[PDB]
Write a protein that binds this ligand. Structure first.
Ligand SMILES: [Cl-]
Ligand SMILES: [Cl-]
Ligand SMILES: [Co+2]
Length: 297
């Protein structure tokens, strides 16, 4: 069940335990949780931001709720205040929603960056490794996770009713198996140099190295991109969805105007840690893939 539909229509929805169970089981099994009726409304004063010309550089519009800092956009202080306010509201509403839906995770949910994406997807064109029309799990060369989960909340806020078109691929374990013969260890000392030179934020663990290989090699495997099991789904305007993007194979084909919120979660906070990419990779390679891993006696 690649997509599990939910009826919640409010950011302050209280959930029954049955729905909470359905959500955590689905999320950890690598399903997308879909909320067709959960819209994120904009203030009148924010409507001007539904315009791609606000993106100023190569990086997209982002906000760090921990530090209250806005990046990737230039303009008048009052306009940056309004834009920061929009993104902050998204961070607050998504964080509250996740705490209402996933009490099992308790305080282990750690918010990361909020993003606003006003550029139309279908007009994009970049390197194959960065081409997100190719199925992938998320792995960022400059930002290793140390094994922690990448959990993302998405809202389509297109004001013309346009959907956001995704494809959702096969389960992570099948993707890993498919690419296994192509995986290789890192060159000795290279990850240490990436750290020393500031190319990576922190040290790229072996896990991060392998997730990156999956990401990159999977995107270059043209036969796999064309023929692997995948379902195309249009997320309607006014909907929200939640996904572990490091586990769910996905691609983005078209759409415009999206809010996105990233959270991190340690593997030991999961209900079923054995389903995580870290544990699946450690089992497949029979080794510890993060050196800072906690030790269980
Ligand atoms: Cl429901
Ligand atoms: Cl190294
Ligand atoms: Co992605």
């Amino acid at each position: 069940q690649p997509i599990i539909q939910f009826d919640a229509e409010s950011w302050e929805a209280e959930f029954t335990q049955e729905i909470q169970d359905k959500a955590i089981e689905g999320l950890e099994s690598g399903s997308v949780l879909f909320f067709p009726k959960l819209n994120f409304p904009l203030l009148t004063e924010e409507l001007k931001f539904l315009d791609p010309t606000w993106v100023s550089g190569a990086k997209n519009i982002s906000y760090d709720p921990r530090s209250a800092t806005l990046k990737g956009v230039e303009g008048k202080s009052e306009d940056l205040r309004l834009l920061s306010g929009l993104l902050k509201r998204y961070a607050e509403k998504t964080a509250a929603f996740l705490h209402l839906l996933f009490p099992f995770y308790g305080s282990s949910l750690k918010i990361a960056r909020t993003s606003f994406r006003p550029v139309e997807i279908s007009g994009r064109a970049t390197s194959a490794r960065k081409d997100d029309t190719r199925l992938h799990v998320d792995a960022f060369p400059s930002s290793p996770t140390g094994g922690e989960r990448i959990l993302r909340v998405f809202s389509n806020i297109n004001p013309q009713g346009k959907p956001r078109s995704w494809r959702i691929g096969e389960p992570f374990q099948n993707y890993l198996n498919h690419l296994l013969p192509q995986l290789s260890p890192p060159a000795p000392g290279k990850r240490f140099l990436l750290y020393l030179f500031g190319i990576t934020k922190g040290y790229r663990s072996l896990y991060d190295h392998y997730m990156l290989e999956l990401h990159d090699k999977g995107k270059l495997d043209l036969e796999y991109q064309k023929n692997s099991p995948q379902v195309a789904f249009d997320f309607p305007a006014g909907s929200t969805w939640i996904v572990f993007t490091d586990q769910v194979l996905h691609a983005v084909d078209k759409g415009q105007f999206l809010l996105e919120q990233t959270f991190h979660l340690k593997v030991n906070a999961l209900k079923h840690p054995e389903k995580s990419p870290l544990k699946l990779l450690e089992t497949a390679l029979n080794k510890k893939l993060v050196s800072s891993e906690s030790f269980k006696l």
